[PDB]
Design a protein around this nucleic acid. Structure first.
Ligand code: MG
Ligand code: MG
Ligand code: MG
Ligand code: MG
Ligand code: MG
Ligand code: MG
Ligand code: MG
Ligand code: MG
Ligand code: MG
Ligand code: MG
Ligand code: MG
Ligand code: MG
Ligand code: MG
Ligand code: MG
Ligand code: MG
Ligand code: MG
Ligand code: MG
Ligand code: MG
Ligand code: MG
Ligand code: MG
Ligand code: MG
Ligand code: MG
Ligand code: MG
Ligand code: MG
Ligand code: MG
Ligand code: MG
Ligand code: MG
Ligand code: MG
Ligand code: MG
Ligand code: MG
Ligand code: MG
Ligand code: MG
Ligand code: MG
Ligand code: MG
Ligand code: MG
Ligand code: MG
Ligand code: MG
Ligand code: MG
Ligand code: MG
Ligand code: MG
Ligand code: MG
Ligand code: MG
Ligand code: MG
Ligand code: MG
Ligand code: MG
Lengths: 155, 188, 260, 125
RNA sequence: UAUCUGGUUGAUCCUGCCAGUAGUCAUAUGCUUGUCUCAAAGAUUAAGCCAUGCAUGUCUAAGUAUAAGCAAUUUAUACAGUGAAACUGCGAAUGGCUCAUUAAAUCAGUUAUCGUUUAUUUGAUAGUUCCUUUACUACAUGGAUAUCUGUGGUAAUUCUAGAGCUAAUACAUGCUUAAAAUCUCGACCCUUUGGAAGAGAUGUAUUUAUUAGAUAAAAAAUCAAUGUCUUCGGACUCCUUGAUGAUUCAUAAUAACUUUUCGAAUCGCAUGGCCUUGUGCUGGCGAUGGUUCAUUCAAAUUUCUGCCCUAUCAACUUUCGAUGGUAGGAUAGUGGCCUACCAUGGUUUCAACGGGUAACGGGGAAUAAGGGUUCGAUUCCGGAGAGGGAGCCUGAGAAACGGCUACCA
RNA sequence: CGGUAAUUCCAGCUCCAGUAGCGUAUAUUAAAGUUGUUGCAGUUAAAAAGCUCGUAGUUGAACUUUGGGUCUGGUUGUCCG
RNA sequence: AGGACUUUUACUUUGAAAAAAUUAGAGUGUUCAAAGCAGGCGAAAGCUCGAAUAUAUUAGCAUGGAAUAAUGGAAUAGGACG
RNA sequence: ACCCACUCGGCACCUUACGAGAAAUCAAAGUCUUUGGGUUCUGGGGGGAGUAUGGUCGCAAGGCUGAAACUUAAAGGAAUUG
RNA sequence: GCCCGUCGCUAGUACCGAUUGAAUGGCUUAGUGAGGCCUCAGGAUUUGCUUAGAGAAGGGGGCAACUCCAUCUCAGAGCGAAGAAUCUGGUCAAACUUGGUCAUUUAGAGGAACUAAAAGUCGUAACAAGGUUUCCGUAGGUGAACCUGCGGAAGGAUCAUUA
């Protein structure tokens, strides 16, 4: 779901105010800026050496992670550059002393540095309002597959 | 009267929210500046908490910066050639942020001449020794020399004339220019 | 409400001003000043109620106007000045000096304190920043902006303002095993020693405090104010030294110390 | 708008309003101590019930529990200060055994009658 | 504050409801009514309509005094006293009332603003306004303007047109004023290690580019570039760096930019010291201002969870923004908040969407073995509203209504 | 209850209950184990879909270190100082 | 106090929090009480103790525990260590 | 193919209360005030009424879903004596 | 003994209902759209710089470039600066007209009912073997309860034929 071209749209895609000097003869790939979101969260090497842009990247973009940290399960990875996470919980009805299974759908913005798919449990972090509904940035794909790490059977 | 609150929008689910708390003053939105070229005419607007804002409609000259050697000069904007949002602004010569314009480019030219003196487009001993110590490091790339011979520089504006009132930006240079000229050749 | 609010109804006043719920519809709203109004103490409350030197509003106004009150070496002629925690109130008449420290019930108790030490004040460091032209500065809890501080003074620290020049006299570094005061919540007025300060990556530092009676509790770091070294407080602690005797122990104190 | 001060009821009429034995007992207590109405017995029964709810709640709590100690001995000292509970039975288990007649006995009416300066209960009233 | 009783039958045991019983900061009403304390009170229907009268104006020794107002006496040649009026400044956005709209809406608990504005209060905060400085008001720059004096108009309204003076912390301008260091440009020489007479700019504010804003730990060779000292082997040994969990943060630096913001032409009291003994030089305590950064009162948004009945409401939303992407505009600021072009998405049997609420949410009230049921218009906290709707000036703060504009009634 | 002896209607006498309060109306709570999670019933009193499959929901067999010995700290009831 | 890996929960103990008023409840002769946060004691010559506590059963934060209930490891070894 | 003994599963049956019910009776209608193995559907006095309306299925017949206004002190279950 | 239905009378409740009704409110197609705000213009008037030539009479403090002067004063003309009415395009959009739609009230000829009142009428279905056992589903019929046909069920009037 990611275009091969590093910039695909009409506007140019650059990290604002990080400049690579063309007159210089170092001729490294580019000058890519990055940061660590803290909380003992490892920045992915796919973001470290990657070539995407993703204005709203917790690791490379301007957005900062602060506030709530929510763990959930991916219910929809199939809309562009964003994720829909199913968070399940038990509401405690006290008149019966009984619990009640309930679910909420939290939109978030997964960076291209992560490879997500339906069913992955994801640790996500609070940030600024990114869109009308997304307020969280995907920070870790804990379960990449879960039960699909081993697929084939060849003794 | 143009509100920017979220109440008039439908909910994430899609329900039509009922009207509530008729829109306030801390939620207002003002008219677009849709600036033009020529006969500088900046109108002050008194916004929230004082803080004079400046609408910069009809702006002709502004500061522009060169990143390679890092030098800024006041120069004239001469039309807009590309806009990443809407080509309608390009046809109407509406100047907003991130628009791509042409530059008279003379001030950069004789700054280069008094700085390196390579005679693009085709003394005291102190200046001669400065140039000798420079030792022709001014190996600036070929396309900028091409439009120097043409005489009009390709620049991308970076200031917001709608808010700041200025007309500041930077010249396209390096792969930047590359990208956009492809787009321009798409237009051509 | 469209704009700021300038009225404080009597029931909405903090229960540490602890006024009478009758005999008045409103309560003195503290004007803007060095302290949060929820945490501060208006001068009218301190004089009319705590000291009873006055009788009502007009008397407090007359007292403040003729420049007998001196808050931290300054006159402060406004009725609802937020004289907050650790401020010094000087009355040249009766030559008396007070320092506002919470009694362990958690209230701004009347603390008559000597003239010699009244020259200075203590303060908690809430920020250490670099202002324009590269000048370091420190913001205390009073909002005092002290310029050119000691280079190794950090946040959450404590410092000793001379209160005359308003500069840096001495400071105490926040770390384990240090005498400390509590300035909010259930542990108001409590004084102890820092046993441990659990970091809690991501926010809301907590510190464990053990007092002289060997009781232990835990409090937020925003809520904490280092006051000196164990056995050597840098100020004169109020009567009781904030041990928080149990209600049964308080009853035993009432029974034992009793003469009529 | 000024902060209200809380008025509160001090009696509770019984559920069965026409119990013959209860009515006769109430009249006996009214005539013994010269009570003007039968609301007086309701008030004393309500006071006894409040004291008793507190006593049973404290009893439910575990022995040697700070709440039990503090509030229990507070209630006992208050009742022995009133005089209804004799010093012999300061135990918080005899406090449940108090009867309405005990609080009736400590009224200034009956005390003036006991001292003898009033030779009749209605004379005391 | 764990209780039952009368009624189906000729009679019985049940299921069952009706009725009885006790409440009710739940009202209404009937009949009575002596005292002290205390107190709700046009919420229910009509957020229906309003005569009339009040409900916000404000002056200190310290902004402006020529009222032809008062005091004219012990303080009075500009002025001092008191003081109408008016200009100026500030509040009028607080308070008070009502619950009409509103069902993830408000609100409650709990977070966030490294996503923003903030009069005031409190603490700090600036030499450069000179621009070629060998000719300027800085011992003080200009013009209006209310109040007032007089002429009116209208039937009337806090309706004001014309004329004549007049002021400011009102409106406009504008001066000093150091040194230092850093950048840039050179009248020359003397053969390199090239190194130097000298000239202009640099406060802050705004805008844009770029740089620094470091940091896990011992040694090398080499090549180039070429810097100091050389006791001419070569050594380079010394490099300064704050905060958070994180940043493009704080801050600093370079280049520039601006229809060029601020950097005291303001008041009161006391009027001391130096003698350069003159109105000379300096000089205290305050009051107002004033840029920026904090702090406080806050304001806006904002994370998780929590709402009454209903399926005789099962699919809802998107051409007109519905979900997301990017760029721009607007915003104080994030944000489909709006626009342009793309993607076709988002919610839902864990009840979405729709409908109803004689629903404002909550702290709480009644009731009480325990579990609960009902109520919460109203003394506190929030929200909303001023007949219904929209629109806006002033300010720090209003979509204000005891502020205006228009439509509807 | 009232159909010529009305303990029930209208009155007089006596008495009863609350008492400066009492009576009515609606609403509501306990009574209501007549909303039942604690805690209701379904053979005939009202009430087991005609039967079976079946998504969601609810629920779901057993099993993965149990023992011991010592030292030692508080708290008790110990016997008494 | 730093790199390093962290199976994840549900559950439960403790604490910080859940504004005051209200409920509970301590002290206190408003003449008693509803109440109120007062008051008390000197020799009468200024000296004083107060304005206690608990609960809120949900959501969030920290913390100790590991029975009960659920998920995950190593089966193609692409497993664990040196 | 019978006979004897045992066992699993099924339609059933006799006796009994030591258990349950208002009883008739039930070996489940027991293990229920000493109240909790999992789970689905249904009922809240009688009548109006399984009526009207609104859906939905059906060619039609009709099926599924399905009240209220109002009225009523009973309707009803089992058993006992006539 | 008890009771069932049709028809007959009275009061109430509710429904359907042609009238292609009526009102209110909600949205809404289409067409108008006040007023504010922004913008394009516009330019009454107020002004400042200028030498733009006069009378002013030392209209400088020396008959004269006054040894001109913040000089009397308009034709100047330019250059500004502020700037009202008016006005171009939007923008927020109230509201109007026109139909459409839905929701609630709202009448309404007439029709089909259901209750309560029990001393009307015609029968006597059910409760006993109710004198044809009863009841259920379905279909037909008929003054009326009801009858009949086909399958059931005992809540039957049999728990029973190894006679
Ligand atoms: Mg208000
Ligand atoms: Mg009960
Ligand atoms: Mg019967
Ligand atoms: Mg009978
Ligand atoms: Mg009843
Ligand atoms: Mg009297
Ligand atoms: Mg009303
Ligand atoms: Mg004024
Ligand atoms: Mg005066
Ligand atoms: Mg709704
Ligand atoms: Mg950088
Ligand atoms: Mg910065
Ligand atoms: Mg954007
Ligand atoms: Mg309402
Ligand atoms: Mg309310
Ligand atoms: Mg409510
Ligand atoms: Mg209402
Ligand atoms: Mg309110
Ligand atoms: Mg309003
Ligand atoms: Mg009205
Ligand atoms: Mg203001
Ligand atoms: Mg309004
Ligand atoms: Mg009004
Ligand atoms: Mg108002
Ligand atoms: Mg007005
Ligand atoms: Mg008689
Ligand atoms: Mg039942
Ligand atoms: Mg039957
Ligand atoms: Mg039945
Ligand atoms: Mg069945
Ligand atoms: Mg299933
Ligand atoms: Mg198991
Ligand atoms: Mg509270
Ligand atoms: Mg009480
Ligand atoms: Mg029924
Ligand atoms: Mg039926
Ligand atoms: Mg139908
Ligand atoms: Mg029977
Ligand atoms: Mg009728
Ligand atoms: Mg127009
Ligand atoms: Mg016949
Ligand atoms: Mg028959
Ligand atoms: Mg026959
Ligand atoms: Mg026959
Ligand atoms: Mg028959």
């Amino acid at each position: 779901s990611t275009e091969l071209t590093v910039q695909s749209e009409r506007a140019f895609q650059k990290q604002p105010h990080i400049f690579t000097n063309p007159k210089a003869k170092a001729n490294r790939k580019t000058k890519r800026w990055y940061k660590n979101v803290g909380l003992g969260f490892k920045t992915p090497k796919t973001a470290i050496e990657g070539s995407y842009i993703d204005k709203k990247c917790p690791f490379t973009g301007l957005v900062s992670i602060r506030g709530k940290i929510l763990t959930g399960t991916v219910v929809s990875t199939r809309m562009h550059r964003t994720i829909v996470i199913r968070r399940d919980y038990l509401h405690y009805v006290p008149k019966y002393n009984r619990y009640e299974k309930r679910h909420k759908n939290v939109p978030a913005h997964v960076s291209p540095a992560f490879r997500v798919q339906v069913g992955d449990i994801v640790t996500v972090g609070q940030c600024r309002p990114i869109s009308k509904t997304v307020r969280f940035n995907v920070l870790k794909v804990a379960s990449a597959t879960g039960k699909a790490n081993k697929q084939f059977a060849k003794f | 009267g143009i509100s920017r609150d979220s109440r008039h929008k439908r909910a994430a689910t899609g329900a039509k929210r009922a009207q509530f708390r008729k829109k306030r003053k801390f939620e207002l939105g003002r008219q677009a500046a849709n600036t033009k070229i020529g006969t500088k005419r900046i109108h002050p607007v008194r916004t929230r908490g004082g803080n004079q804002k400046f609408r910069a409609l009809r702006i002709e000259t502004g500061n522009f910066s060169w990143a390679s050697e890092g030098v800024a000069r006041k120069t004239r904007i001469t039309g807009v050639v590309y806009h990443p949002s809407n080509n309608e602004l390009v046809r109407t010569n509406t100047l907003t942020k991130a628009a791509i314009v042409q530059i008279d480019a003379t001030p950069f030219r004789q700054w280069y001449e008094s700085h390196y003196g390579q005679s693009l487009g085709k003394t005291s001993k102190n200046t001669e020794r400065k140039w000798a110590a420079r030792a022709a490091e001014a190996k600036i790339e070929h396309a900028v020399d091409s439009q120097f011979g043409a005489g009009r520089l390709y620049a991308a504006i970076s200031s917001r004339p709608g808010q700041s009132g200025r007309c500041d930006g930077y010249i396209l240079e390096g792969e930047e220019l590359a990208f956009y000229l492809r787009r321009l050749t798409a237009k051509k | 409400a469209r704009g700021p609010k300038k009225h404080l109804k009597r029931l909405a006043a903090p229960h540490h001003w602890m006024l009478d719920k009758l005999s008045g519809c409103y309560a003195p709203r503290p004007s803007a000043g060095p302290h949060k109004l929820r945490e501060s103490l208006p001068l009218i409350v301190f004089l009319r109620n705590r000291l009873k030197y006055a009788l009502n509003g007009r008397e407090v106004k007359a007292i403040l106007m003729q420049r007998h009150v001196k808050v931290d070496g300054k006159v402060r002629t406004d009725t609802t000045f937020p004289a907050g925690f650790m401020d010094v109130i000087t009355l040249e008449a009766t030559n008396e000096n007070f320092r506002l420290v919470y009694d362990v019930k958690g209230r701004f108790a009347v603390h008559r304190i000597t003239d010699e030490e009244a020259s200075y004040k203590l303060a908690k460091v809430k920020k250490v920043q670099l202002g324009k032209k590269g000048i370091p500065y420190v913001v205390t809890h009073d909002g005092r902006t002290i310029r050119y501080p000691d280079p190794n003074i950090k946040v959450n620290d404590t410092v000793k303002v001379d209160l005359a020049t308003g500069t840096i006299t001495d400071f105490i570094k926040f770390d384990t095993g240090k005498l400390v005061y509590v300035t909010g919540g259930r542990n108001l007025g409590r004084v102890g020693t820092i046993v441990h300060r659990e970091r809690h990556e991501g926010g809301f530092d907590l510190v464990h405090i053990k007092d002289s009676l060997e009781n232990t509790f835990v409090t937020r770091l925003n809520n904490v104010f280092v006051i000196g070294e164990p056995g050597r407080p840098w100020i004169s602690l109020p009567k009781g030294k904030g041990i928080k005797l149990t209600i049964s122990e308080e009853r035993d104190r009432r029974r034992a110390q009793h003469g009529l | 708008p000024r902060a209200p001060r809380t008025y509160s009821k001090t009696y509770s009429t019984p559920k069965r309003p026409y119990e013959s034995a209860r009515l006769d007992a109430e009249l006996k207590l009214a005539g013994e101590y010269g009570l003007k109405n039968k609301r007086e017995i309701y008030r004393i029964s309500f006071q006894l019930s409040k004291i008793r709810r507190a006593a049973r709640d404290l009893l439910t709590r575990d022995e040697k529990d700070p709440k039990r100690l503090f509030e229990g001995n507070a209630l006992i000292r208050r009742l022995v200060r009133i005089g209804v509970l004799s010093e012999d039975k300061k135990k918080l288990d005899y406090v449940l055994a108090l009867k309405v007649e005990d609080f009736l006995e400590r009224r200034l009416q009956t005390q003036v009658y006991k001292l003898g300066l009033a030779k009749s209960v209605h004379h005391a009233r």
